[PDB]
Amino acid sequence: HGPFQGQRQNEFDLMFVKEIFKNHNSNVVLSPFSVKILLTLIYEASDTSFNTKRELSSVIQDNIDHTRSYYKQLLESAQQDNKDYDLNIATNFFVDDFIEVINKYQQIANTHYHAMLEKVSYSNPTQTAATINNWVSEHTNGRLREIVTPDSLEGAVITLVNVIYFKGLWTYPFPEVANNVKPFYGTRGKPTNAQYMEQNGQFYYDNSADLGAQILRLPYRGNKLAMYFILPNPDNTVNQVLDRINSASLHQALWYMEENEVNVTLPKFKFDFSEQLNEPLQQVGIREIFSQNASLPLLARGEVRVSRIFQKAGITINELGWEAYAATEDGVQIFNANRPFIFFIEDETLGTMLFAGKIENPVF
Numbered sequence: 556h557g558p559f560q561g562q563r564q565n566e567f568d569l570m571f572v573k574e575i576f577k578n579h580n581s582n583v584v585l586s587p588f589s590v591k592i593l594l595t596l597i598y599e600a601s602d603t604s605f606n607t608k609r610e611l612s613s614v615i616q617d618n619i620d621h622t623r624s625y626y627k628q629l630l631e632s633a634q635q636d637n638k639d640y641d642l643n644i645a646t647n648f649f650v651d652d653f654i655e656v657i658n659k660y661q662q663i664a665n666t667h668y669h670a671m672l673e674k675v676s677y678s679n680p681t682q683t684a685a686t687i688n689n690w691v692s693e694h695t696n697g698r699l700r701e702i703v704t705p706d707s708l709e710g711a712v713i714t715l716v717n718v719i720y721f722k723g724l725w726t727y728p729f730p731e732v733a734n735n736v737k738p739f740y741g742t743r744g745k746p747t748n749a750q751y752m753e754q755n756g757q758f759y760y761d762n763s764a765d766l767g768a769q770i771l772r773l774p775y776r777g778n779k780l781a782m783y784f785i786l787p788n789p790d791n792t793v794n795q796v797l798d799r800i801n802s803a804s805l806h807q808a809l810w811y812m813e814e815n816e817v818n819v820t821l822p823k824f825k826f827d828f829s830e831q832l833n834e835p836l837q838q839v840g841i842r843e844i845f846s847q848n849a850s851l852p853l854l855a856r857g858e859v860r861v862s863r864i865f866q867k868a869g870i871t872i873n874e875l876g877w878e879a880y881a882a883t884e885d886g887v888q889i890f891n892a893n894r895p896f897i898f899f900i901e902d903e904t905l906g907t908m909l910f911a912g913k914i915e916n917p918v919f
Contacts, residue, residue, distance in 0.1 A: 556778050556903060558759055558809060563906035566802050567591060567613040571818070572911045572915065573797055574835045576897075580743070584828045584870045584912035586719045588629065589644050591715055592668055593832075595626055596646065597844055597861060599663060600854035607843040623667035629907050630669050632779070639777030640723040642909070645694035646670035648686055648861075651677050651712045655856035672854075677712065680705035687716060691867065695720040698878065702829055702867045711862040713851070719868050721880040721900070721910070723775040729754045729821075729874035739822060740894045741916050743790060746897070749822035749893070749917045752874050758819065759812040760888055766799045766808050768790040769892050771819065775876060779904060782877075783809070784821070785897040786890060791911055793895045800897075820891040824917035829867040836864070859890070 568587035576583055589612045598604050598611045604619060616622040634642050646668065650656055656672050664670040673690070675683040688701045695718050702716060729752040739749040759772035768787050774781040785808075787796045833845055843849060849860035875882040877900075892914075901911035 558812065559779070559901065559903045560773060561906055561910070562806060563802065565805070565906065565908050568908040568911070569800060569805065570613075570839050571804060571835065572908075573800075574798060574839050575830065576600050576837065576913055577794070581825065581916060582912065582914055582918075584826070584868045584910060585830065585866060586644070586717070586868055587908045587911050588633070589646070589717050589866065589909075590832065592626060592630070592644070592646060592670070593715055593864060593866075594836075594841070595622060596648075596664060596668055596670055596715070597851070598622075599668075600660065600851040601844075602628050602850065602852045604853070607849065610841050610843055611658045623663065627667040629902070629905055631903050632905055633907055633909055634669070635779070637777055637779075640775055640780065641696075641721070642717065642723075642780075643694060643696075643720045644669060644717070645690075645719070646715070646717045647687075647690060648672040648673045649683065649714045649716065650673065650855070654859060657854060657856050660854045670898070676706060680708045681706055687714070691716070691718050691856060694718055695869070698869045699827060699867050700742060702865050706864070707793075707831070707865075712859055713855075713861050715741055715861050715864045717864075717866045719910070722876075723777075723780060724876040724879050724882055725874075726774040726776055727754065727756045727758075728876070728882050729819075730885055731874045737893060739917060742895055747916055749824075750919050751820055751822050751893075753818065753820045755816065755887065757814050757820050758817045760815045760890065761808065761812040762788075762815050762888075763808040763811065765804060766796050768796045768808075769818065772812060773819070774903075778901060780900060780909070781903055783899050783901065784890075784892065786892050787894065787896070789894070793897060796897065816885075816887045818887050818889050818891075820893065822892060822914065822917035823873050823919040824914060825869075825871040825919050827867060828870040828912070829865065830867055832864040868910065870910070876910055
């Protein structure tokens with residue numbers, strides 16, 4: 556198939572990614588597309604969906620039948636059960652026992668958004684925490700084990716939880732080298748060390764003058780997903796490249812990529828990232844759903860609102876792929892990621908930004 560040739564609907568994704576990155580000096584990984592699913596579930600729960608209505612608008616498509624078929628299509632493309640990779644997006648409302656969940660709402664949540672709702676007693680936060688964390692494990696094959704503590708449930712009535720799980724094999728795996736530690740030149744402070752992997756191959760690549768960054772595409776098996784790496788030039792920082800990234804400028808930067816011989820050096824890393832999404836959503840202007848005027852009348856039989864939104868994701872990158880442990884294996888450009896960089900995972904048939912993140916200090 557090759558890289559995506561259409562126009563991505565990534566305005567919200569990039570706005571939100573930027574807000575998260577600007578508030579963390581660490582490694583980050585999240586699923587921007589999954590945050591849009593969450594917002595659309597909340598939109599479906601509001602009577603407005605026939606000011607909460609206005610903010611949630613780069614996410615809505617704004618007729619409700621088009622919205623559901625859109626998200627349902629993109630979810631099923633990304634998760635499509637297949638032999639080459641495993642991807643699961645899981646979303647649950649954990650609802651206090653006194654709330655009557657409307658059955659037609661459970662129906663649309665499962666049908667179009669691959670989401671569910673579950674009753675808990677928040678008067679027993681220890682029990683509730685355990686229930687939510689066992690759900691996370693069940694739906695990420697144990698890769699993630701916990702997302703909340705009793706203390707993070709204090710005062711909660713409805714908690715909305717999203718996790719994502721991905722296992723994928725590189726189309727072009729790296730050779731395994733036993734001992735390949737080298738320096739890594741982080742943004743702040745003296746250099747660290749990281750374990751690296753290196754290969755030569757044919758990859759879509761450009762040195763973007765517009766963004767001040769090299770861009771590299773490493774595809775996964777299955778003719779659907781690929782990982783993009785944006786490596787700021789040495790004169791530039793991740794934060795400067797980020798300020799240059801927007802829907803149009805990222806569109807053009809990918810547009811300019813073509814297949815080239817590239818020597819690729821990447822650090823290996825493994826981490827998870829969890830975030831309560833209320834504050835960053837409010838920072839990007841999504842405020843009414845957290846206000847005293849928020850309501851969920853199409854979800855909860857009548858006033859209640861979402862208390863807290865949580866998202867977590869794990870990432871493991873090595874020679875074989877993403878969470879991969881077994882496999883089957885001169886004008887060269889040099890892409891040597893020994894400085895911080897940005898990455899994302901895209902459904903190349905539709906443009907979906909399934910994962911986004913940055914590496915500030917790679918630890919494996």
